[PDB]
Design a protein around this nucleic acid. Structure first.
Lengths: 297, 21, 316, 317
DNA sequence: AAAAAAAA
DNA sequence: AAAAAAAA
DNA sequence: AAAAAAAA
């Protein structure tokens, strides 16, 4: 009885990858979501060209992409995902035509087209959530080249324009910088670099990340923070019997998504919600990336 | 007069010899 | 069984320099690499003129270069390299025509031209790596006239535009400053002043710098750092029996490429622009340590506080 | 016997000044070098006017110079220099015409003209070296009003554009400031304010300054430093037997030109703007030392903390 | 502390 | 310490 | 840690 949001994603993944899509591996799910996102944004080879207002270089790139041979059944997308012959039918029937606007579909009154557009929007949102989680997971051990100062680190993740369009609240980068460094409308969302995003293996099944579920330290750290967040967040994970790179979540920090403040610096604490109750844990003063590097060996 | 002592041969420059101390 | 990257460089060096090319001397290999880099960039006398958008002065300089007599067989290039009669044929056949672009070559579909362009690009990459290593080696005793403050020293080495084009992650100078001080795309590479480049005598044979290989102190220091880097790096080397200017590598520093010490504000915590200095107020920069990967395990070694150039001068 | 540059300078000075040119007086040599530099830059009266891109005021100045009568034979120069009757022939022959460029001379292919231009360039370099040495020598007992703060002292000596062109690595002033502020190419040279320049009586003879030479304190100090340099450099001298006025050189300072004290950030370390002052918080500059190289070896001498000008003034009272 | 380039 | 594209 | 709108 999953929400239609996740049901559409599961159906699309099954139709495009068949049985090669493993619904238990985070990397496989992330790769499948990225492929579906780039398919639904009309970015794959052989798809329609983005030439509404493209410049010379962009026009040439789009023309080359259109002329380039499209992916065929049996192609390897990632490490453990293989496309199926049904991918062409799914792309032709589910992906809205380039430039389609929901207002026109609603005005037309066609129930099927309205459903298709709603499912496409939901799939874009889910895929961008998975992409943001994967970006956090990647940055936990390998930081971006553009991130040099707090000014640069304030706009992580550095996702593309479509990513920002789908999830402006979670996505950062250049377009988030533009939106923040500019006029703000009523429907303006603040970039929450630490919004809780359950791991994709949990997201695609609707499970809510909570205390008592088996996850990895990197999994939890990428769910509730990213590479340059403070290392105290590591206290939210506790190794199980024998460790084995799998532990359990003991809490989730409060004030994760929102915050406004309008010796002592290292004496700051973070609130953690535990089964017994809220506790305050002293900060460590070092970023999660640096702490993981130091504890690696 | 001038009390400057420019940096030379690895020494550190002085803005005023008297004030140093 | 070398990779095509080094095989191309060896074939080119042999063809252009006959038997005079010695594959055991770092200086000779650096000179040969510089000559081949200037030959494959159409910088030698008698080659095509760079007049696509040249100004008056640049147009005149390029025209003079084109009119100038080209090098002849038997010419001395450096100290121990002599050009052979085959060098003209090699330059005619192996150097792509001025302005050639890989896109057009690939579109044409000619296998020979595609292979030639790939070989040229790989040779440029190898030659620029050797050039950066030689710049580090030179700067260990003779600092650049342009390096006056940390802002100037942050962009070493100062190499030409083609050098940056070949290896953006190693080369610095004016173009690295221009790129960093500007829009950064997805395909943006950060200048790694301390990236490990094996000595050319090792680079041109595929040997990877590691623990236990005979090198010289200047060799190792130029491989893992440069003149103005802290002096503690000298602990990576250790002289052998009798010294004789030849020792052995006993370690290699860690955190040579990836180093970030930021902590963004999160979950009600305040942001930090640098973890080390924050502390409590004790700003003792001489108590910092570096991580050295020895044969046994990683060890923390206290910093010296004096640049490698200054330390070498004092210990000379 | 002598390099090309020194031979050219000696020949030119002998031709212009005849026997009135004393070869063992620093002041006489400096005055002769200044006059030759004026002659070879078309700055004297009766020479070609500079109008190429000159402003109207500059055009008027150069036209007045051209209209002005040129120096006549026997005219006194400085203190003890007298122009010979043959100076006009030397000026007409050995002085390249205004606007001459080495590239054009090479294109002409005349070996005599090429050698003439090479001699002219070497003479300009030697004259500018003598000019810088004389600027240091004067600055030991005559503070420049233009030098008020370390920012102003950073560009000593303040010599004309010709001097900077001849010896960019020794000559400072407005043009060195412009070059440092502007773009830096591969030929950019930094102002070596304390580079060693032998006294003119030594420079013309080619005897490189070293240990054991019989020199005066002022001339040696001008050789290795200038007025506002630290006073510890006075340790590079020693009075001779019976005091007198001329002593001997006991050593020379080290790190004359090569001196960088930065330590960039590397391998997780934090950058340093200056190794010396960093320390721990004690910025006592009086505890620094300079390495003087002598016959026996290298010795570290504590800095005096007082300018050379002030040390000379105090020792003269 | 060589040579070739090259005015407020 | 890889594949693609690309001068003052 | 939902509905609506909407590129260098």
């Amino acid at each position: 009885e999953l929400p239609r949001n996740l049901e559409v994603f599961n159906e699309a993944c099954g139709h495009v990858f068949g049985s090669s899509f493993n619904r238990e591996d985070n990397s496989v799910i992330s790769d499948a979501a990225a492929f579906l996102f780039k398919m639904h944004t009309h970015s794959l080879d052989g798809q329609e060209a983005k030439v509404l207002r493209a410049s010379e270089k962009k026009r040439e790139r789009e023309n080359a992409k259109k002329s380039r041979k499209a992916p065929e059944a049996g192609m390897r997308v990632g490490r453990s995902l293989i496309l199926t012959s049904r991918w062409t039918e799914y792309c032709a029937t589910c992906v809205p035509a380039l430039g389609s606007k929901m207002k026109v579909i609603k005005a037309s009154g066609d129930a099927a087209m309205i459903q298709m557009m709603k499912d496409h929007n939901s799939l874009l949102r889910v895929c961008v959530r998975i992409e943001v989680w994967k970006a956090r997971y990647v940055s936990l051990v390998a930081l971006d080249e553009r991130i040099q100062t707090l000014e640069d680190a304030q706009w992580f993740p550095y996702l593309s324009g479509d990513s920002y369009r789908a999830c402006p609240g979670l996505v950062g980068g250049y377009f988030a910088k533009k939106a923040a460094a500019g006029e703000r409308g009523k429907n303006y969302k603040k970039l929450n670099q630490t919004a809780i995003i359950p791991p994709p293996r949990f997201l695609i099944i609707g499970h809510r990340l909570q205390i008592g579920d088996q996850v990895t330290l990197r999994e939890l750290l990428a769910s509730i923070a990213w590479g340059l967040c403070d290392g105290v967040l590591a206290e939210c994970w506790s190794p199980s019997q024998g460790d084995g790179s799998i532990g359990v979540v003991v809490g989730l920090p409060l004030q994760a998504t929102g915050s406004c403040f309008l010796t002592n610096l290292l004496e700051e604490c973070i609130a953690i919600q535990k089964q017994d109750g809220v506790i305050k844990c002293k900060r460590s003063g070092k970023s999660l990336y640096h702490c993981l590097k130091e504890t690696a060996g | 007069s001038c009390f400057l002592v420019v940096a030379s041969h690895g020494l550190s420059a002085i803005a005023d010899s008297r004030i140093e101390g």
